Amino acid sequence: GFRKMAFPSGKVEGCMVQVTCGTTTLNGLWLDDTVYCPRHVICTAEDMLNPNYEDLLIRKSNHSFLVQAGNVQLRVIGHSMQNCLLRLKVDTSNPKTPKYKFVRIQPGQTFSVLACYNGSPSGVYQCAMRPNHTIKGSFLNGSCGSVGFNIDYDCVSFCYMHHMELPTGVHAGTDLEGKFYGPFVDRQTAQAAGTDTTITLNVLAWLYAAVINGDRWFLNRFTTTLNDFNLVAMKYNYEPLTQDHVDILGPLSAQTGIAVLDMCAALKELLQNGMNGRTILGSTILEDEFTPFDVVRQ
Amino acid sequence: GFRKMAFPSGKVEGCMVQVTCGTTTLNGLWLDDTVYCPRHVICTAEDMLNPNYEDLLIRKSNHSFLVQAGNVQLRVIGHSMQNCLLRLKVDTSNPKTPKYKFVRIQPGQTFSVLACYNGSPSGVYQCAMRPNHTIKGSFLNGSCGSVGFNIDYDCVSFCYMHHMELPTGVHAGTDLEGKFYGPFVDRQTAQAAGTDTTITLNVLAWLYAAVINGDRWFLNRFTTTLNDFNLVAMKYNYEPLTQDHVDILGPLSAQTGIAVLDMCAALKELLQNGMNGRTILGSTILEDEFTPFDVVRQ
Ligand SMILES: CC(C)=CC[C@@H](O)C1=CC(=O)c2c(O)ccc(O)c2C1=O
Known part of the structure; x- marks a missing residue:
């Protein structure tokens, strides 16, 4: 009859890469000469919760990040942190970079999520930012770093990057400057969202x-x-x-x-x-x- | 979370083109040097009650089919008919043609649809072939020729080309050899879907x-x-x-x-x-x- 529809994911698919640090792998967003990803990629299993990310990041160098854009690896030539994202700077600039913006969406607003596994897209769906700044979405193994977005004309508005699943099975993430939505932190502790409400x-x-x-x-x-x-x-x-x-x-x-x-x-x-x-x-x-x-x- | 998910649409997006014939325009699929679209493109209202497609096609020339892949015009270098489809041969071969198959899905199976409107992708959704060989889909004016598909590995399995909406509001069409799903015909006719069973x-x-x-x-x-x-x-x-x-x-x-x-x-x-x-x-x-x-x- 009438359907939930996701935006065509193609302009995003060509920006999806695989970031591995140590033994941990997740998805990155390759725009121009910069790769974004959750900073949790620098966390060995021993570091969950009691993580000091500035501490863990000073001990790493550019060579401790392995970026793979499909099959081709990209040279990481710089690295810094912004809130809960890593900004990895790479030698080559994504030729598939679309016209794009970073937007922080408000609760109630909807967007399309491109679910990825180790840098390769797997599915696309539409969802909404819940009023309690979670998203009741679908994020499986290796989904960390997948991006939410809207498209207007030729311009992709990236609004969400996935980080984690709450004890309730609902999902938490940031905008593309690394600031979380809601009251959450990227630590292995259990956290509750506020009571939700209907939009x-x-x-x-x-x-x-x-x-x-x-x-x-x-x-x-x-x-x-x-x-x-x-x-x-x-x-x-x-x-x-x-x-x-x-x-x-x-x-x-x-x-x-x-x-x-x-x-x-x-x-x-x-x-x-x-x-x-x-x-x-x-x-x-x-x-x-x-x-x-x-x-x-x- | 349990959601309906559609496959990443991008591998198909780079195949969507705009076939125009006369005052009537619809979507076409550009794989290698041939473009597929409903043969209904060559009809008009005055030639639609009981059209004879062989007569209508013999009266057309290569220069009757305007094929636009975005900004670029492509020139028909040949044309044939396969069942309810047209195979136009074009000068240029699609640089974006991916690994693909043509496939005939069984009722009950699902697939993703890339709803397009005059060559431009608009949205992606998931749906299922019904037992009565219809689709409870979402197709507005302009979506004729939009295609359904599954992705296994990096191979696209094409399985649907949209043609018509029936009086029930559901939709009928063909595989990518032009054979309709169910008893439907691309004449205007008193046809209606059979009784729909539950999967x-x-x-x-x-x-x-x-x-x-x-x-x-x-x-x-x-x-x-x-x-x-x-x-x-x-x-x-x-x-x-x-x-x-x-x-x-x-x-x-x-x-x-x-x-x-x-x-x-x-x-x-x-x-x-x-x-x-x-x-x-x-x-x-x-x-x-x-x-x-x-x-x-x-
Ligand atoms: C289940 C437990 C109580 C919470 C785990 C949490 O520590 C975590 C796990 C994780 O897998 C992850 C990513 O994969 C990517 C970004 C990111 O922030 C994270 C995380 O915060």
């Missing part, structure tokens, strides 16, 4: 997507006020609806002919009465990983 | 995935022979389970320690009693597009 803006945008594809069964004649809806929102572990949230949904309400607060009344009913086993857009759950901008695109 | 192999795999994830409320201790299960399944429009399917579930059995026929005895009760409420991996309907292979990957 209200994305549920409403997703309700509009159904109305567009001829799914109107959940609509009603009623309506709420902003604060009236938010009190059902808090009761149900949903993000409060900001006044600008309404303004983002503006164009979607026009295309459908449903005032934003009317769609809220519909959502208010949906949350309090269940769905009676019916399905919206094909799902039996209120889906919160499509953005307004996602819905207009697809 | 029992993939529902069983979904149930194993859920046992691995946490919920096993649906397990019971009844037993069932293969035959008495297939009889119940067919009354509910579920595919009968073959003996080969039972072997394919070997790894997921044993790993859970559940025994295939016992998971069938569970499904049998889900079919005969439903779920008056209870959820499975968050939903109240049984996913049937996740293969045993997708589950053993996590």
Whole structure:
């Protein structure tokens, strides 16, 4: 019916390399003459938790990093740390380098993840930054260093690099300057995320997507006020609806002919009465990983 | 996390071109010195109710087919018809043509789609060939010619070229020898998909995935022979389970320690009693597009 879709991963695939330090291997992002990767690559198994990364990095030289762009190795001619990433400088500059930016995405926003194993892509999927700054994603053995990204025109916006799996099975990582999302650190200690909540803006945008594809069964004649809806929102572990949230949904309400607060009344009913086993857009759950901008695109 | 993942699209992206014929444009696949696309490109509205493709093709010349690979125009140096496909021969040979195969997938199997819009890749998703030989896919105006595929090693197995949407909203098309999946024809016609059965192999795999994830409320201790299960399944429009399917579930059995026929005895009760409420991996309907292979990957 209507699908989660990932951006075409090709401009990213050509930047994926394999970084090995000592006995540890993960994925790196080769842009221009610089390779990014998680700094955890300099950690022997003995160093997890009680890791002082500045200490471990002063003892390494350029030769202790082996970069492999597919089969060809690249000469590492410099190295520095930035927050939780390593910046490896290499002799040759990636000819496949796309037009690109580094962006720190906000919670609620979505992006595509290219899952990699030792520098070779394996799969692609779409996900969202959860409000608790984790991502409920899929990262298996050797997935460390895979990047999340969006594409606009010819320009790749890299927003995420994977680092680790939390005890809850959800994932933690940084932007491409090495700053984590949320309260996490790259140490072997157990860490909890904050209590998650459902992305209200994305549920409403997703309700509009159904109305567009001829799914109107959940609509009603009623309506709420902003604060009236938010009190059902808090009761149900949903993000409060900001006044600008309404303004983002503006164009979607026009295309459908449903005032934003009317769609809220519909959502208010949906949350309090269940769905009676019916399905919206094909799902039996209120889906919160499509953005307004996602819905207009697809 | 358990998500639908699509293969890295890039090896296919570098093969997508834009075939134009008359006032009508669609997507084509550029491998070596020949380009494949639906023969429907040579029709018009006035020549579409019951077209004779041999007459329409004899009336075309090499110079009738504008082939654009991005900015570069390629000049048709030949043209033939293979079933419901056209094979245009072109001056230039694709520098990006990867190791490939042409492949005819069985119903139940999955593949990735690169949805394109006039030569430009737009998005990637995963889906499954249905038992009725349709695809519950996502194809807007312009996506004709987009191709489905799997990747094993660095070899692309092409297996679908999109052609039409049926009145159900699902989609029909051909392998890369032009032979349609199912009984469909590329005339405009009163055709509609047959009754769609559920992929029992993939529902069983979904149930194993859920046992691995946490919920096993649906397990019971009844037993069932293969035959008495297939009889119940067919009354509910579920595919009968073959003996080969039972072997394919070997790894997921044993790993859970559940025994295939016992998971069938569970499904049998889900079919005969439903779920008056209870959820499975968050939903109240049984996913049937996740293969045993997708589950053993996590
Ligand atoms: C399971 C344990 C309690 C947590 C392990 C953690 O110490 C860790 C493991 C890891 O494999 C890893 C990478 O592979 C890549 C980056 C990166 O930060 C990391 C990590 O922080």
